[PDB]
Amino acid sequence: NQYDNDVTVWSPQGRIHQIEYAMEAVKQGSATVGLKSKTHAVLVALKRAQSELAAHQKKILHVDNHIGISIAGLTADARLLCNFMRQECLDSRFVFDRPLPVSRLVSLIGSKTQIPTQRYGRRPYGVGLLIAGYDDMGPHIFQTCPSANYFDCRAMSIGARSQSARTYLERHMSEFMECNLNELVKHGLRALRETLPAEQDLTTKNVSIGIVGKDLEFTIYDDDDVSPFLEGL
Amino acid sequence: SYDRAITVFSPDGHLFQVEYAQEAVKKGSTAVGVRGRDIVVLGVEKKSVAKLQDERTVRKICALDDNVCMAFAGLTADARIVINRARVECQSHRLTVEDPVTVEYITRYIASLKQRYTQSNGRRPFGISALIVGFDFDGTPRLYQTDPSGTYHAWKANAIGRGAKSVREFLEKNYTDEAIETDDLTIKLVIKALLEVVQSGGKNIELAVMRRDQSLKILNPEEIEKYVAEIE
Amino acid sequence: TQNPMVTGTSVLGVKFEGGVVIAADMLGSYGSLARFRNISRIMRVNNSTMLGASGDYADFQYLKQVLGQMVIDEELLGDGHSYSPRAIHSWLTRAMYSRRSKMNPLWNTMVIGGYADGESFLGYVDMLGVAYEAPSLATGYGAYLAQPLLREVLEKQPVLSQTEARDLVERCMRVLYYRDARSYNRFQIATVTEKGVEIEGPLSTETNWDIA
Amino acid sequence: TTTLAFKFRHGVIVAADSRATAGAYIASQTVKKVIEINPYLLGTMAGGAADCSFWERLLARQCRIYELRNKERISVAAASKLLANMVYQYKGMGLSMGTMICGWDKRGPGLYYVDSEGNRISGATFSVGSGSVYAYGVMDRGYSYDLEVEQAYDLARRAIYQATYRDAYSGGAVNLYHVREDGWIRVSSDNVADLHEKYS
Amino acid sequence: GYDLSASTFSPDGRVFQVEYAMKAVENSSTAIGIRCKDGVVFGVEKLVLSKLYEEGSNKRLFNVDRHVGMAVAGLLADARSLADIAREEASNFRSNFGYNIPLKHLADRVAMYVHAYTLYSAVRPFGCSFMLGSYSVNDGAQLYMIDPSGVSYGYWGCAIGKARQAAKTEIEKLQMKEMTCRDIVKEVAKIIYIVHDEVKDKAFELELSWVGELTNGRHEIVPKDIREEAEKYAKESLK
Amino acid sequence: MEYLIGIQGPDYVLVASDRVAASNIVQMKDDHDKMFKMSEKILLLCVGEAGDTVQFAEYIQKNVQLYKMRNGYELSPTAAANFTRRNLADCLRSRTPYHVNLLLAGYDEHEGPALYYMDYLAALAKAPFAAHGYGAFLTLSILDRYYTPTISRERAVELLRKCLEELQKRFILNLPTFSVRIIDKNGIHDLDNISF
Amino acid sequence: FSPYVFNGGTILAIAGEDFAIVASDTRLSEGFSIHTRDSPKCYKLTDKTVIGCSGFHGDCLTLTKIIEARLKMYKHSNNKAMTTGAIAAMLSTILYSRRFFPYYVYNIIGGLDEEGKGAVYSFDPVGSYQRDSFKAGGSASAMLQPLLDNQVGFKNMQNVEHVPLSLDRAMRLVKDVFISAAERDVYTGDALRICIVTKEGIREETVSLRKD
Amino acid sequence: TTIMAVQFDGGVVLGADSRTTTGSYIANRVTDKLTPIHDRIFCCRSGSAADTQAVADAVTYQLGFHSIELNEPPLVHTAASLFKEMCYRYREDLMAGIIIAGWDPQEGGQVYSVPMGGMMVRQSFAIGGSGSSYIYGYVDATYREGMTKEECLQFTANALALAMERDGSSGGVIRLAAIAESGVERQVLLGDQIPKFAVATL
Amino acid sequence: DRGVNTFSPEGRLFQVEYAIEAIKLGSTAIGIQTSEGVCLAVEKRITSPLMEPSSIEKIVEIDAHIGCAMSGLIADAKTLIDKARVETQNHWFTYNETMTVESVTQAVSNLALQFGEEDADPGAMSRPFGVALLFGGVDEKGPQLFHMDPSGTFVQCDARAIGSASEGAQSSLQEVYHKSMTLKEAIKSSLIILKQVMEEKLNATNIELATVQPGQNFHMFTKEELEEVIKDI
Ligand SMILES: CC(C)C[C@@H](C=O)NC(=O)[C@H](CC(C)C)NC(=O)[C@H](CC(C)C)NC(=O)OCc1ccccc1
Ligand SMILES: CC(C)C[C@@H](C=O)NC(=O)[C@H](CC(C)C)NC(=O)[C@H](CC(C)C)NC(=O)OCc1ccccc1
């Protein structure tokens, strides 16, 4: 076709095929789950290793003391976006001496990601994120897509076989608000486990957890540090 | 400002433009170079005298600096541009290091220039391959070959251009410490290698040599004829 | 502003139990000439902040415009986040320091007050970027005349009520009118409380004894 | 400050006091004024401390980059030229730097003087700083290309001690370095009080 | 291949890229806006893709200024970009000319910005249609609509989305010139509920906003009590 | 201040310069060379502000050698002098002027010996003899007195000794040793130093 | 228009076997006036480093903000906190970035090294930094330095056993030197802030001084 | 120089002298310092002639384009704000103080002051120029609220005449201009028309 | 007729995929991580006897404690190596410390995928780097080994093989590798795999070997040591 080579070409159905191709690029990555309670936000990601001797790729990255993102898609675009987030947060702290609200950071991300989708010879950022953070208005979970569109979510999962996690979260969304930190982390892990095939399990070497809360700066748990949560399956 | 990607990847991972530059150098004239014990030689096959062309203005052997020369094969104009850039670089190096350039330094600079040209925007790869020979301050002779891809290797004897494979096979079969025993034997080796490709022989040969602590010298046609007669 | 043209006199500030009070005379002086006598030198940044400015009045207008536009742009978003007085103080400090570095200073000396999260805020921003927070502030000639009275009262009684703060501000303004040569009788009082920002019209120092 | 370096048969010696003053206030008496660019090359500080430190550190960075690229250690002449060309772009802007580059290249011992004023001259005996003249006196009266190693050490120590004695803005400890074909070694750091007790 | 660039004219004299952008906006949900004597009222059929999204995500009603609203349809990223542009234009107008931007002027500026993307091959047309609503004593209640082509026209009632025809049919039978905002919110809810399709679309949430005399010339969401009364009235009307 | 001198004869140019490099009050070097070899038959003598002299001379040296390699024939003394003047004049009005005083000596196969004078303002001039620095004030009179166009190189060396002896007798600065060189059809020859 | 102003302030740093002390007074001045009495000049950077800035207050604030931002950048790009030596090197680079518009700030760093032992780094406005065992900077540097050299350095005293410094003795010395300085130097007074850096954490104390 | 504007119910009354000096030499003695920015907006120029003329031309261009864009009469506040922006941005290079007065339907007659530095304040009556310092007391004492057009014209003429009498940079003729809904009624008082106040002799 | 920044329906960048394809045409390089150090081996791939083996620089030194092995387009690797060296020295100058292996890998990876056609730079890059890298060195966290591809994705690897013989060399590494391997065992295993996978016979002139250990700096084996190891194995 002649309508699926540039991002400045409209299809006769009002679709920009490159944006859906970037969406597919996001959907072909590893699965992540994010969920929030009335006092906490949890990011759970499933890391994939190229070979048995290759360290599992990291997926939860710091942004500030109150923001963290899980990535699903191109790693270079992920790092570029993370650097932009960090610079924006540092600028906000330097100028105003206050944490940057998560919603404003997501808005800036959307504005930045829009520009490529409207200019010649530029590609959308082939990465989808799950921002988790705590601001003055409580915990937040946001989802970003290469289409420069974002949504405020109670819970979400993006990546390969993420529909099973989405169905689980929808079924069990009622209890999320009134759940201790351990219960919420276990719910996120259960959502992530549903994505795995039958012959695979959640080990300490392929699970990452990111907690942010009122009295808990954003922390990344990996390796043996995720054992306490895994116990109780 | 032209900002188009002239050189791009293709399935199977080939930079087709660089392959076409290789083809261009293949279609070019023939050049030979041999590293001796105390002498470095360069040979070039003249396409045709034409009986009315000044040999002074068609030389394919040039001196980048006092201790470095190089002969090329491919498109002449790109060779001229590369020669000028290399000369400017040699002068700058002598200015800011207070020591004469080494052969390795200048070949690496030329290779870097070619790489930049095969990865930049709106510009095609260079279509020449250069044999760079000279003497370092330590007195050790050197000989390097550079390709449009930006790859440079150190050779003891190589050929580029038309009939590169045939001359290279001849050199491999007929290169030994015995053949590099004396300077005259080395020049005879270069002439013999060139004669494996050039039809007329003798008349259609351009030969230059550099000795240790001596300026680059182009052998006059009489000397080339004398060596050709000696070979036969 | 390399050369100031129309300038204001000191701006006072004292924090009480449940807000802050700022006073500034209505006067624009062109070098020993009360050219403008009905200009307000107190700004209401938002529902929980205020800003009184000394020095050049044109630069005060510029800061007023920029800060108002910032507050508006924030409100349009409607995300439930308010620029805290500390945020405005930090932004002002950064702007003044940047202008100083560029060698094009904003000739002003502002006093920022606010009430957020059940805590009073009182900041000082200088032309050169000097920033600090203290219970009492006094710019210009107030630092020599009015500040001692406020500091003595606060040291004797760290926590003051609203009426005591207002009386202290009135006394300090009276002293300034007595002793400062670029001062005016008419002045404004601004207060920030949990109820918001209120600015009192043109008051007077009629309690001016002149026993000679 | 007073720093000196002279070339003799067995290498090049480098000496320097360790006093830094801010006007008339002695900021420190333990300032290292000999920088180790590489095990076979070293420089000296004199003038503005910040300028000399920054530009010598940048010179060390550039020398390491050169070594990595060319697989051969940089020469003293190359390092001196690099520093001179790098500080020349800031001529007239107030840089107060006087340095000596000492080492052992493929051409034998080297010794170069570099100044913020643009000078770059090689030589056998050099001394830079406030006490440069006082050190020059003793160094010239006692220098000889055929000095024994201990005699060279004594000459450098005595020159720096005399410069400290006659100069107010110089003092502290006399650091002494010796360059050889196999690198440099720091031989001693003797305090001026002990040297005064030994000589007087 | 006459429809691969906004800089190419088809033989009939059409710019097919703008047509495809119009089709792209035509594939989104419906948004209606009715002008009344007091002011203007907006309504958006905010479809909910999944129950995981919070109430308020993907908001399609923006405040580009104190006194100007914005209801969008189509690609939401483009809508947000245009909203930021409108905010910038309003701020510039206030800074330079020293007073609030008239709605007609802002519509003109944003339309001209949109039109600049329908001329070159280096940029694609915006895939979003939006409406602007403002009220002031000097100027009165105003409502405008801007399409991807850049055409800006004033409207007593507008509808952008897939159900534009139905919404126009329902709006056309209202004496909006004499009714007030309070009586217009209920009608907007009725229209949104009527145009909504349940067989195709799963569920939706009603988003309302207005600006008029009751609000002192400020654009803000309709309070929860008023919105709930409007939804109850719409459900009763549908029966 | 430094010292330069040049005598142009029938078939040669004789040049000499001092070998002192003083920082403030101390002669930090005693065998400095102030002559730059531009080509096989061209010399440049530079005296002036520290840093400017070396930078300018090395830049001109690089450009001249680059010309020689690019074209295969060396630049003529007149061409080199004009090139130097053009560069200096261009840099005169910029933000990075060079405060350097020059003296260009060279030999040409056709035209013959040439001696060129150039000041920090880039005013080129050709003279049979010339000098630079505060020592010129004392040597120009001697050169005018004892100079003839048909002067042999030996007699020219004697005249240079006369000038340097006058410098030793009358000038205040210490200029003990002078480097001496001569350019002829055979190239540049380095003659014995004049020492005191 | 003068872009600089001296706001006073004294800083002190002591390095011990297993601790580091950073002390500063809490007075901010301008000319002959006093801005505040609760403006500490000790800023905490990490869990094992403290930096004390004195001089021009605006430049001090800007530098502190830059250091905080750079610490966070290094943590993000290297996934590990910076050491005291890294902070010193970065500060030296930053200060020299503005050689032609220098930071009118006197800096001092105190914290543990990689081995767990104390370390103190003293800086000049241009960037020169040296690893010292004790150092005082600011208005009363000349008044504090000699006493430290005599007592902890045991200078100019013969037949004195060089017992290693103890934390109690270090705190006593800091308090005494600051009390003595407050008696002579006008710019130093109000109150004293002491930061003790150890493996357990950073402890803070405050002892009052003269208000004159 | 002496420039003045007064505000009455329905419009404004402007007035300025007609002297342009280059030291002690009167280059122009009939200069018109009241410049029509728009149909019903006027500016009184004090300070540097070149700066004031350039600013006036720039504001005229901007305001005309603005009026064409919005099919409605301009606002006096808009002209005042444009002058304020231009003067504040280029305060270091400009030497010009301006008074802006005119009529618009929204707020009626208004007077604005834009002195050096780019301030903007609305006043009932504004004065400016070198000679304004000599009539501050007069305007303060003889100003009343709710004056009539004729009374304002007489007041402006009297105060301007005093300023011309006492200031060496002011002189010539008094150029008055009244702006209201009807239009602009321009006037020029010269010779005996200028108010006269007797001088003492002992 | 598609631009460099173009997405396939499978959510991949065509140029990056083709660059991955070009890697498979390069020489084989192996690296192994051990508690005693990191070893690196490469295949010289000599074409004619007249070529000096010493001129084939397939293992280079970034700093005194880091080395890089590469396969693919060497001319492309030169720029990345120069960037790595400059970054390491810049870090030393600014912070007076040795850059971590992960930091150098990240800095070099950021360069990849920074190519475009419109509005990039006067001399921006037009295509991805068609060369794979194998970083190895000792940091505060001990010996480390990292693998970088044209896509800019870097992962810690215990033992990785890159090049034409990657498929099969990796299998042999899986068969032979254990956590407690010693440096000599690692070197011998790498040599065995290289001998098995090379088309030509293995000798001391047609292979390169380098090691980095906590005590010793980057060391490149000479003919004597290589011959000793070859004889032993
Ligand atoms: C290498 C230097 C220490 C040599 C030393 C000479 O004795 N320099 C000096 O004493 C210079 C003299 C100046 C006129 C160049 N004086 C100085 O005061 C210099 C620079 C200031 C002017 C900002 N040193 C200075 O103040 O900093 C000393 C210092 C050094 C390290 C850490 C903390 C403080
Ligand atoms: C706005 C004007 C129409 C009013 C007029 C009345 O005083 N202005 C002036 O007279 C001002 C003097 C200024 C110091 C107030 N003079 C001017 O603007 C003159 C007028 C010439 C064209 C004859 N030109 C000018 O640029 O000023 C001359 C000058 C230049 C430098 C210093 C002092 C004076």
What residues in B contact F69, CB-CB < 8 Å? 63-65, 87, 91
- I63: contact with D, CB 8 A cutoff: yes
* Helix-helix angle H76-89:H49-69, to 10 degrees: 130
Domains: count for chain H: 1
Query: Where do the domains of chain B lie, and which CATH numbers do they carry?
Result: 1-232 (3.60.20.10)
Question: C-alpha C95: how far from its chain's center?
Answer: 17
Q: Which amino acid is at E158?
A: C
DSSP, res C80: S
Interface D:F, ≥3 CB–CB pairs < 8 Å: yes
Domains and CATH numbers, chain F: 1-196 (3.60.20.10)
Cβ atoms within 10 Å of E51's Cβ, excluding its own: 14
Burial G97-130 (b: 16+ CB within 10 A, else e): eebeebbbbbbbbbbbeeeeebbbbbbbbbbbbb
Cα(E57)–Cα(E46) distance, integer angstroms: 9
From the DSSP assignment, how many helices (H) and strands (E) are in chain C?
A: 4, 11
The crossing angle, in degrees rounded to 10, of helices B221-231 and B183-195 is 80
User: Cα(H27)–Cα(F97) distance, rounded to whole angstroms?
Assistant: 46
Tokens, residue D90: 């800031």
Which ligand does the CA of G99 lie closest to? 1
Judge residue I53's burial from the number of C-beta atoms within 10 Å of its C-beta, 0-12 exposed, 13-18 middle, 19 or more buried. middle
Give the Cα separation of I154 and I138 in Å (integer).
17
Ligand nearest to the CA of H50: 2
- List the F35-39 sheet strands across, edge first: F35-39, F42-48, F100-107, F113-118, F125-126
Nearest residue in D to F31, CA atom: D123
Judged on CB neighbours under 10 Å (0-12, 13-18, 19+), G87 is buried
Query: Which is nearest to I129 in space by CA: I75, I89, I199?
Result: I75
Nearest CA to ligand 1 atom 5: D20
Residues with CB under 6 A from ligand 2: H 1, 19-22, 27, 31, 33, 45-50, 52, 169
State the closest ligand 1 atom to the C-alpha of D50, by its place in the atom list counted from 1.
20
CA of A162 to the centre of ligand 1 (A): 64
C-alpha distances in angstroms, A150 versus A106, A157, E82, E214?
Answer: 7, 14, 16, 33
Using the mean position of ligand 2's atoms as its centre, give its distance from the Cα of residue H27 in Å. Answer: 9
- Is the CA virtual torsion H78, H80, H81, H85 positive or negative? positive
H178 close to H184: Cβ distance less than 8 angstroms: yes
Sign of the CA dihedral running G12, G13, G14, G20:
positive
Task: Report which protein residue has its CA nearest ligand 2's atom 21.
Answer: H22
Distance CA I128, CA C155 (A): 69
- Residues in CB range of I103: below 8 A, 6 or more apart: G77, G78, I91
CATH for E217: 3.60.20.10
Helices (H) and strands (E) in chain H, counts: 4, 12
Amino acid type, B133: V
Reading the block at residue C81, the tokens are: 């986040």
Residue E62 bridge partners (DSSP): E70
Q: Which residue of F has its CA nearest to B98?
A: F58
- Beta strands in A37-117, from DSSP E residues, in sequence order: 40-46, 60-64, 67-73
CB atoms within 10 A of CB A137: 12
Do E106 and E90 contact (CB within 8 A), yes or no? yes
Nearest CB neighbour to B149, from listed I49, I75, I124? I75
CA of residue E107 to ligand 1 center, whole Å: 64
CA distance C73 to chain H (A): 21
Q: Is A touching F (3+ C-beta pairs, cut-off 8 A)?
A: no
Residue D178: strand pairing partners: D13, D185
Instruction: Extract the runs of DSSP E, i.e. beta strands, from chain A.
Output: 32-36, 40-46, 60-64, 67-73, 127-135, 138-144, 150-152, 155-158, 207-213, 216-221
* H22, H25, H34: residue to mutate for ligand 2 pocket, most atoms within 8 A of CB: H22
Distance in Å, CA D164 to ligand 1 centroid? 16
User: Which residue, C40, C25, C34, C47, is CA-closest to C6?
Assistant: C34
- List residues of D with catalytic annotation: 1
Ligand 1 in reach of D22 Cβ (< 6 A): yes
Q: How far away, in angstroms, is C53 Cα from ligand 1 center? A: 42
Closest chain G residue to the Cα of D32, Cα to Cα: G130
Fold of C1-212: Glutamine Phosphoribosylpyrophosphate, subunit 1, domain 1 (3.60.20)
Give the nearest partner residue to I85 out of D57, D58, D65, using CB atoms. Answer: D65
Domain limits for position I135: 1-233
Q: Do chains A and D touch (3 or more CB pairs under 8 A)?
A: no
* Partner-chain residue, chosen from A6, A53, A120, that has the shortest CB–CB distance to I158: A53
**Secondary structure (DSSP) of B48-95:** --TTTS-GGGS--EEESSSSEEEEEEE-HHHHHHHHHHHHHHHHHHHH
- D33 Cα: distance to centroid of ligand 1 (angstroms): 11
Computed on alpha carbons and rounded to an integer, the radius of gyration of chain G in Å comes to 17
Q: Tell me if chain D has a CB within 8 Å of the CB of G95.
A: yes
Nearest beta carbon to residue E53 from set A9, A107, A151: A151
Which neighbouring-strand residues pair with A134?
A139
| Chain B residues within an 8 Å CB radius of I75 | 111, 114-115, 118, 149-151
Contact A22 I11 (CB under 8 A): yes
**Cα four-point dihedral sign I135, I138, I139, I140:** positive
Q: Which two tokens stand for residue C92?
A: 């002002």
Could you tell me which CATH number the domain at G1-212 has? 3.60.20.10
Distance D16 CA to ligand 1 centre (A): 15
CATH number for the domain spanning H44: value is: 3.60.20.10
Q: Are the CB atoms for A115 and A144 separated by under 8 Å?
A: no
Minimum-distance ligand 2 atom for the alpha carbon of H169: 7
Task: Return left, alpha or beta for B150; rule: phi > 0 is left, psi -120 to 50 is alpha, else beta.
Answer: left
Give the distance (Å) from ligand 1 centre to CA of residue G125: 10
Contact E66 C72 (CB under 8 A): yes
As a whole number of angstroms, the distance between CA E185 and CA C140 comes to 55
Q: Where are the domains of chain D?
A: 1-200
Interchain proximity G76–A86, CB inside 8 Å: yes
The experimental method is cryo-EM
- Residue among C130, C133, C134 whose CB faces G58 most closely: C130
| Domain count within chain I | 1
Q: Which candidate in G67, G75, G76, G79 is best for mutational testing of the I interface (most I CBs within 10 A)?
A: G79
Best mutation target among F27, F29, F55 (most D Cβ atoms within 10 Å) is: F29
Has D173 been labeled as part of a binding site? Answer: no
Q: Domain spanning D1-200: which CATH class is it, in words?
A: alpha beta
Q: Where are the beta strands (DSSP E) in F49-175?
A: 100-107, 113-118, 125-126, 129-132
Q: How far is CA D130 from CA D4, D20, D21, D34, D192, in A?
A: 11, 12, 12, 16, 17
What's chain G's length in residues?
A: 212
Q: Which atom of ligand 2 is nearest to the CA of H53?
A: 1
d(CA B83, CA I70): 30
CATH class of A1-233: alpha beta
> For the residues of E122-151, what is the DSSP string, one character each?
TB----EEEEEEE--TTT--EEEEE-TT--
Active site residues of H: 1
E229, with CB counted inside 10 A (0-12, 13-18, 19+), is: middle
Which chain C residue has the Cα nearest residue G26?
C132
Please answer yes or no on whether D82 and B96 come within 8 Å at the CB atom. Answer: yes
G126 close to D48: Cβ distance less than 8 angstroms: yes
Residues of G with Cβ-Cβ distance to C2 under 8 angstroms: 1
A158 near I CB under 8 A = no
Q: Which of I45, I33, I65, I57 minimizes the C-alpha distance to I147?
A: I33
Choose among I58, I57, I67: nearest CA to I101.
Answer: I67
**Could you tell me which chain C residue has the CA closest to the CA of H88?**
C58
Contact C94 A95 (CB under 8 A): yes
B97 CB within 8 Å of a chain D CB = yes
User: Please, are residues E77 and A117 in contact by the beta-carbon 8 Å criterion?
Assistant: yes
Signed CA dihedral, B221, B222, B225, B230: sign only: negative
G123 Cβ below 6 A of ligand 1? yes
Nearest-ligand number for the alpha carbon of H23: 2
Containing domain of residue E48, as a range?
Answer: 1-237
Annotated domain spans of chain A:
1-233
- Going across the sheet that includes C187-193, the strands are C136-138, C11-16, C19-25, C187-193, C196-203
Start-to-end Cα distance in chain G: 31
What 8-state DSSP symbol labels residue F192? E
Domain-wise residue ranges, chain C: 1-212
Ligand 1 pocket, residue G104 CB under 6 Å:
no
Place of tokens 């048995």: A52
Contact D156, D125 (CB under 8 A): no
Resolution in Å equals 2.9
Q: Are G17 and G165 in contact (CB under 8 A)?
A: yes
Look up residue G174 and give its two tokens.
Answer: 């800091």
Q: Where would I find the H helices in chain I?
A: 14-23, 74-95, 101-111, 166-176, 183-197, 223-232
Sequence length of chain C is 212
Ligand 1 atom having least distance to the Cα of G126: 23
How many domains, chain E? 1
Residue A119 in contact with partner chain E when CB distance is under 8 A? yes
Q: Which of B3, B111, B156 sits opposite I50 (nearest CB)?
A: B156
Touch between chain H and chain C: 3 or more Cβ pairs under 8 Å: yes
Residues C91, A96: C-beta atoms closer than 8 Å: yes
How far apart, in whole angstroms, are the C-alpha atoms of residue I116 and residue A80? Answer: 15
